[PDB]
Amino acid sequence: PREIEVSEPREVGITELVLRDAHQSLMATRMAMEDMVGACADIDAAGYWSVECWGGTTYDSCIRFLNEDPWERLRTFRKLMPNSRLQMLLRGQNLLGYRHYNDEVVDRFVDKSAENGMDVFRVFDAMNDPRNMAHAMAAVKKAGKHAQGTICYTISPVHTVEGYVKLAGQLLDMGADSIALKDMAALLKPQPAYDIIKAIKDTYGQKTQINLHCHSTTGVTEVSLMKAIEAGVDVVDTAISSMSLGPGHNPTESVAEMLEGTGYTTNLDYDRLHKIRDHFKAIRPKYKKFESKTLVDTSIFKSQIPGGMLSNMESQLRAQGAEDKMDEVMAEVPRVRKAAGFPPLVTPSSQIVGTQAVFNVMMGEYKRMTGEFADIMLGYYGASPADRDPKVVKLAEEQSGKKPITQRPADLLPPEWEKQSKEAATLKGFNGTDEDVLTYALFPQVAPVFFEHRAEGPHSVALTDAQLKAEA
Amino acid sequence: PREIEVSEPREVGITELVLRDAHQSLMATRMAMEDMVGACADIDAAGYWSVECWGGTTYDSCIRFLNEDPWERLRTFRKLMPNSRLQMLLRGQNLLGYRHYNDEVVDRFVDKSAENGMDVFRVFDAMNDPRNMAHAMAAVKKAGKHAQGTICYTISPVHTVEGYVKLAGQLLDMGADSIALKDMAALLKPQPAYDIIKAIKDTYGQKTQINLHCHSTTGVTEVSLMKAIEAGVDVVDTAISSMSLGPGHNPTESVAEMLEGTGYTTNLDYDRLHKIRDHFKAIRPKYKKFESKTLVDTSIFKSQIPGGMLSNMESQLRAQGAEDKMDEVMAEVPRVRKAAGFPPLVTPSSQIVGTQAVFNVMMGEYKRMTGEFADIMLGYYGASPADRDPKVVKLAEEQSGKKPITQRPADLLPPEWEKQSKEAATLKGFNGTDEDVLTYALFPQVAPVFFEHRAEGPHSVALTDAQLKAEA
Ligand SMILES: [Co+2]
Ligand SMILES: [Co+2]
């Protein structure tokens, strides 16, 4: 009988994700605003450390499918949840956009987010390249808001506890007010959860604030949450029980209840949590057309491939006849990833790698690369966790005509704000605010159609109470 | 920074529940035999410590809804899973029946179960009265099979770690080959899971075999499983991922994967587990008409009332108009339970207490008691964990005319085998075996209808592949 050191009795902070990541993961970010605002009061009085309610795919979803202005959604939340720390997910130099943007666009986006009420900015990069997060972090500090540097967790031959402790130091070196360990594919097991959270605390000290964001996709992360807390994690992200599990997250009430008697405790009001649970439990059924159909999947521990990525490929394979070659492409991924430097397999890396893996089982190994893949191999998306296969790099140099870069990609981007400003100002509907110019800069394709319909007001693509009853 | 003692690195045994409890909890025990046998080979080679595949509600379900002979199902499993230890759930002196039976019926039932292949018998009692489990345990030892004494976990003012360690000793005192901690309502939290499993091991020694059966109804039991393993639990019950969570159990693959690096390990073959997962993942959809619609519910931690019990009452309340008195009956339960001696709230105690609670909010407090309730208060179902309110006892004595007893109820039951034998032998279809006589003794009402249709062969009340496609 050995022994395990655990942190002193203490409160554990909880961030509620129901308003953003939960519906983004369980119902394709289609959650309408009218189905959320009725819980904002209770959520505000629940006792959460922070409430994730913006950023991520919600901006896209708002203008693309709900005819809703993300900014207006941010202002209503700021108003309905006055005492809460609002939190968002922002993908560094990419913001919530489709590409890297010149620093001047980042400054404004952060600026307006803060100005409209955002308090905590979780800045992250798919490649885990601290340089892509650098300027975003700065803008956040400039606006006097909380800058949370993010480490996208993943499993690979080059990812080690030491490798994560180093990244933490870089994030702190660039002024991170706290470090977020983000595990979107529920790959973080219990021992690793404990060792990593302990290693960071031991190296930079107990005052270092760390927030653990784990999905429940594989079904082992709630145990990791307990281990992270024993290791001393400061805040853990959860989703209200009526909106949890599956590709979602662990249950807030479940994570709050499991601690009774451990010496660890949460600052949550269970009666409030109970109102928020019922609120979404009544609403969720209307979103049945967008739910996933797998509650637990551990396959990723053997294949390194996340369901969303696996399926996306399977379709590409049928849409091209002989898909049965799935077994072949499922074996090419590991090799393609390695070539790219073992980037964490999250959007967009996951589709970039997945797709390329197909063009390797199809035409031939790198006989032809997509423009996106070539861009990763050449460094236009940043630095990889491990050096990329010089061979495949050269091949990309020859197939693209672009030369490899190794410095922060945005270092080559020219000012564009003025160019954006003018362009958006010619679209019917444009209201003149920077907010709208950002909308156009982030979604050039949708900004037009949205600016023209916005006056109609937001909508819902969910079933109506009528459609619901008429179905069953 | 304090420290927590954990058991030495070691293998943890796993019992698969997919074949019995999983479908009993997720799809009203309607799982057809033709939808299970195709996984028996893989399940047999998976590496499970035991495979729960009989007993519980499956006997009833077989003869009542599937026109299937439980005994034939037991013989096919014994044949398709030759190298596995088969396990079942048997409710002591009640067997799988509707009442206590004279010892001679228990002897035969166990006898035939063993003779038809059952290896591990999990004997338990709703009231946790060791005397009701006593003879069943004996019969199991007589037949040279594994006798697992069961402790139904629950939370109440009189249930303590000490109180459970005592029960364990009684179970061992009556020859238990191992102790099963059964938590049907997912009430077992992590610290309690650790303390109880440690207290038992510390008191009777490390060789004492303990199996932990936890449901996932509240969403905190997988963390309890980790704590039980650190405390030294020997075997934990899980359900294959495509048939888990909700009122079900934790995911077998999830519980197997979360241990990597802890020093704890399982003896499971992940590829086999992968075939069993897909097998049930393809079949499960056909049982959609019987699924529950709540994945996580922690309400029971505040109300002591399990969803199934809560709903059952709510219907009784509407079926009697003013149900809105739910808030009243939900407050009477605690008081009614206390009166009965705080019995664990599982079948049948839960309905007996729930119903009576209504007749207390309706007619008046105990103005009228059901015959079942009177029976609990008088002791015809056995001893309660804590002494019953002498007042309410007297009231039952007066309303029933029955006198209170305190000795094992079966001590007053006369031989009945011969009486059963004759009676069943007059039913059209009866095949003459003791097996059939038992069927009649356990389900007098159904034995007739089943004995007459059995020749038609088993059926399925699930959707057909055709009905499935035609629906969506
Ligand atoms: Co997430
Ligand atoms: Co059970």
Is some CB atom of chain B closer than 8 A to the CB atom of A470? no
Domain-wise residue ranges, chain B:
9-292, 293-472
Instruction: Give φ, ψ of A90 to 5 degrees.
Output: -130, 125
- DSSP 3-state of B454: helix
d(CA B179, CA B209) in angstroms, rounded, equals 6
d(CA A41, CA A272) in angstroms, rounded, equals 9
d(CA B215, CA B457) in angstroms, rounded, equals 33
Name residues 242-271 of chain A within 8 A of B (Cβ): 242, 244-245, 250-251, 253-254, 257-263, 270
The dihedral formed by the CA atoms of B287, B289, B295 and B300, expressed in degrees to the nearest 10: -120
Method: X-ray
Is some CB atom of chain A closer than 8 A to the CB atom of B405? no
Q: A144, A136, A83: which is closest to A115 by C-alpha?
A: A144
State the DSSP H helix or E strand holding residue B52, giving kind and residue range, or none if neither. Answer: strand B50-55
d(CA A246, CA A292) in angstroms, rounded, equals 8
- Look-up of token digits 């190794």: A406
Instruction: Give φ, ψ of B273 to 5 degrees.
Output: -50, -35
Is some CB atom of chain A closer than 8 A to the CB atom of B301? yes
Report the 10 Å Cβ neighbour count for A316: 18
d(CA A289, CA B305) in angstroms, rounded, equals 32
Is some CB atom of chain A closer than 8 A to the CB atom of B327? no
H helix count then E strand count, chain A? 21, 10
Q: Which amino acid would we find at residue B426?
A: T
Determine the distance from the C-alpha atom of residue A341 to the mean position of all C-alpha atoms in its chain, rounded to a whole number: 21
> What would the DSSP string read from start to end of A212-271?
EEEB-TTS-HHHHHHHHHHHT-SEEEEB-GGG-STTSB-BHHHHHHTTTTSSEEE---HH
Helix B349-361 / helix B307-318 crossing angle, nearest 10 deg: 40
CA distance A30 to chain B (A): 21
Find, in chain B, the residue whose alpha carbon is nearest to that of A5. Answer: B3
CA distance B419 to chain A (A): 49
SS3 for A120-143, per residue? EEEECCCCCCHHHHHHHHHHHHHC
Is some CB atom of chain A closer than 8 A to the CB atom of B472? no
For residue A364, what are its two tokens?
């031939």
Q: Are A190 and B262 an interchain contact pair (Cβ–Cβ within 8 Å)?
A: yes
For residue B15, what are its two tokens?
């019992």
A423-459 as b/e: b if 16+ CB within 10 A: bbeebeebeeebbbbbbbbbbeebbbebbeebeeeee
Residues with CB under 5 A from ligand 1 (ion): A 21, 184
- Look-up of token digits 């010089």: A390
Find, in chain A, the residue whose alpha carbon is nearest to that of B471. Answer: A471
d(CA B379, CA B362) in angstroms, rounded, equals 25
d(CA B351, CA B368) in angstroms, rounded, equals 16
**Neighbouring residues of A402: CB distance < 8 A, sequence distance ≥ 6:** A374, A375, A378, A380, A396
Q: Which amino acid would we find at residue A109?
A: F
Q: Find the CB nearest B270 among A241, A242, A302.
A: A302
Q: Sort out which chain A residues have CB atoms less than 8 A from B8's CB and list them.
A: 1-2
Q: A305, A156, A302: which is closest to B274 by C-alpha?
A: A302
**CATH class of residue range B9-292:** alpha beta
Is some CB atom of chain A closer than 8 A to the CB atom of B316? no
Q: Which amino acid would we find at residue B163?
A: G
Q: Are B253 and A296 an interchain contact pair (Cβ–Cβ within 8 Å)?
A: yes
For residue B298, what are its two tokens?
């922690």
d(CA A225, CA A247) in angstroms, rounded, equals 16
Q: How far is the CA of A213 from the centre of ligand 1 (A)?
A: 7
- How far is the CA of A66 from the CAs of A20, A291, A450, B338, in angstroms? 15, 18, 9, 53
Q: B168, B174, B238, B173: which is closest to B209 by C-alpha?
A: B168
- How far is the CA of B109 from the CAs of B56, B147, B435, B438, in angstroms? 14, 14, 8, 7
Length of chain A: 472
Helix B390-400 / helix B371-378 crossing angle, nearest 10 deg: 130
For residue A35, the 8-state DSSP code is G
Resolution in Å, one decimal, please. Answer: 2.5
The size of the A-B interface in CB pairs under 8 A is: 137
Q: Which amino acid would we find at residue B124?
A: F
Instruction: Give φ, ψ of B214 to 5 degrees.
Output: -120, 140
**Neighbouring residues of B357: CB distance < 8 A, sequence distance ≥ 6:** B313, B329, B332, B333, B336
Q: What stretches of A35-129 show up as alpha helix (H) in DSSP? A: 40-46, 58-61, 70-80, 103-115
d(CA A223, CA A188) in angstroms, rounded, equals 10
Helix B130-142 / helix B161-173 crossing angle, nearest 10 deg: 40
Length of chain B: 472
CA distance A392 to chain B (A): 33
β-partners of residue A122 are A89, A148
d(CA A171, CA A177) in angstroms, rounded, equals 9
For residue A368, the 8-state DSSP code is S
Is some CB atom of chain A closer than 8 A to the CB atom of B219? yes
Q: How far is the CA of A185 from the centre of ligand 1 (A)?
A: 8
Is some CB atom of chain B closer than 8 A to the CB atom of A302? yes
Is some CB atom of chain B closer than 8 A to the CB atom of A98? no
Answer whether the bond into residue A348 is a cis peptide, omega within 30°.
yes
d(CA A149, CA A121) in angstroms, rounded, equals 9
> What would the DSSP string read from start to end of B220-261?
-HHHHHHHHHHHT-SEEEEB-GGG-STTSB-BHHHHHHTTTT
Task: Please tell me the number of the ligand nearest to residue A249's CA.
Answer: 1
